[PDB]
Amino acid sequence: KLVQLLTTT
Amino acid sequence: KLVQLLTTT
Amino acid sequence: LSPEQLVLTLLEAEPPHVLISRPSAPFTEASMMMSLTKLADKELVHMISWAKKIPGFVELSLFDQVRLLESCWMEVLMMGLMWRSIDHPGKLIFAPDLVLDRDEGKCVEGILEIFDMLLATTSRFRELKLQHKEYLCVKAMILLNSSMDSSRKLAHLLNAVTDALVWVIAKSGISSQQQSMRLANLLMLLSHVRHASNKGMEHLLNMKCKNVVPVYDLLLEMLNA
Amino acid sequence: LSPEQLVLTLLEAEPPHVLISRPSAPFTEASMMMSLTKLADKELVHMISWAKKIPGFVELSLFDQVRLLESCWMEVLMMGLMWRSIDHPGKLIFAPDLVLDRDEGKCVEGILEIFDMLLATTSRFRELKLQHKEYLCVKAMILLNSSMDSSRKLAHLLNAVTDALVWVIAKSGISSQQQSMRLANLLMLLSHVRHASNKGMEHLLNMKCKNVVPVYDLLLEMLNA
Ligand SMILES: Oc1ccc(-c2ccc3c(Cl)c(O)ccc3c2)cc1
Ligand SMILES: Oc1ccc(-c2ccc3c(Cl)c(O)ccc3c2)cc1
Numbered sequence A, B: 001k002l003v004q005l006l007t008t009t
Numbered sequence C, D: 001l002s003p004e005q006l007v008l009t010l011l012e013a014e015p016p017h018v019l020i021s022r023p024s025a026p027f028t029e030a031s032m033m034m035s036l037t038k039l040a041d042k043e044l045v046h047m048i049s050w051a052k053k054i055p056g057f058v059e060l061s062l063f064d065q066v067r068l069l070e071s072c073w074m075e076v077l078m079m080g081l082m083w084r085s086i087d088h089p090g091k092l093i094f095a096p097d098l099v100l101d102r103d104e105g106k107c108v109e110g111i112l113e114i115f116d117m118l119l120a121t122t123s124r125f126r127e128l129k130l131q132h133k134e135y136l137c138v139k140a141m142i143l144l145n146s147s148m149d150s151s152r153k154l155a156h157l158l159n160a161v162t163d164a165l166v167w168v169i170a171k172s173g174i175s176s177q178q179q180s181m182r183l184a185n186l187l188m189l190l191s192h193v194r195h196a197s198n199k200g201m202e203h204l205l206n207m208k209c210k211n212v213v214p215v216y217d218l219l220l221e222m223l224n225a
Helices: A002-008 B002-007 C003-013 C029-051 C062-085 C102-106 C112-128 C132-145 C150-170 C176-188 C190-210 C217-224 D003-013 D029-052 D062-085 D111-127 D132-145 D151-171 D176-209 D217-224
Strands: C091-093 C099-101 D091-095 D098-101
Touching (some): A002 C217, B002 D062, B002 D217, C003 C132, C003 C150, C029 C062, C029 C217, C062 C091, C062 C112, C062 C132, C062 C217, C091 C112, C102 C112, C112 C176, C112 C190, C132 C150, C132 C176, C132 C190, C132 D176, C150 C176, C150 D176, C176 C190, C190 C217, C190 D176, D003 D132, D003 D151, D029 D062, D029 D091, D029 D098, D029 D176, D029 D217, D062 D111, D062 D132, D062 D176, D091 D111, D111 D176, D132 D151, D132 D176, D151 D176, D176 D217
Antiparallel strands (some): D091 D098
């Protein structure tokens, strides 16, 4: 999730 | 302990 | 990237205000933790966007970007909070419609402590009359200094912002000697923000283990790190 | 009282080098924790005397003197540890007869993490080439800023030590811009010393609750508060 926002958003 | 060392030298 | 361009970049990166409604009835222990945990979660999402706009942040390794956010998310939240409550002594502006009074922090088991040191640090900031531009740098510095080759890059990024804070302060006009004094007085406050964060996250952790409110996804991931 | 004279008095407030009377020998888990707690306890006694030698400290209300010490003692302890370790990279000079390596800090669970924090912040001060006179001001500041009518005296006192640290930096003869940058990098590290502090207490307090660490009166009192 944290990683998601960082790399996916 | 703290207070006596604070009030004495 | 000149100090002014860095400050102007941070100003533009200022996340928008997360709107949340204060419960209709007077707070209960749950309703409040409910409102604070929800607010935090939403602000966290906006915080990640804000971070990726901090000159050179995205250049760091992902694992670094992660460690930084994991270790400072509460400080950045509270630094933003304090700033919002700046022109409202005794009052804590968690949001435009969610204004909390020092006394309301009694419906929560042991949060009043937190609310007090938050108001205190705020009063210090108000006393020192913290400026918007200074605030943007102090907040950005909190993130970069939470280091609690890529690392070397980190040092350079943090210096860039420090140069920016110095640049802003100089523009106040006060004597050089006084610029050092204000710069110093502002930074000494970072420890207080740091403390509140620790007793703020410890408190949050307890609540969860207490089941006093649901804490999941982003809010949870950040809690454990 | 000029900044130079204030830094002098701090040098004069410097506590003596403390040893734990432990003959050279490999460290175990129980042998290491007792040494660290026996050392901290001795240093604690010397720390009370130290602060009392800080101009105006005794002038404060007894309540303040206590609160200030009950909250910063661990930080002041680690700050001292870092200055003594500054020249022995990879080692933590707790005391002449108590030097520890990062690997030796593995015997005790969690300690390794703390050791890293201490070693990191230390090597960090090392790169900045921390000067003794700077160390004196910083440590004094840690005391006077651990605060979360009498207050004026404190602020006025904290202010003086800050003014003293600025002086020290100005005497190094470096650039003005660099004088601000150095002052900044130094104050930012307090956040790190404060972080390894909260963790240090957490670990110690956990050890206390388990009666695995010998009973030390001054140490216990300071921990409970
Ligand atoms: O912008 C913001 C939004 C929320 C907070 C905040 C501060 C302290 C908190 C504590 Cl003690 C809790 O137990 C649970 C949630 C909390 C949330 C701080 C700044
Ligand atoms: O000058 C000094 C002397 C001792 C310490 C120190 C640091 C970490 C400690 C930890 Cl983690 C413990 O569990 C128990 C005792 C400790 C004592 C720090 C500075």
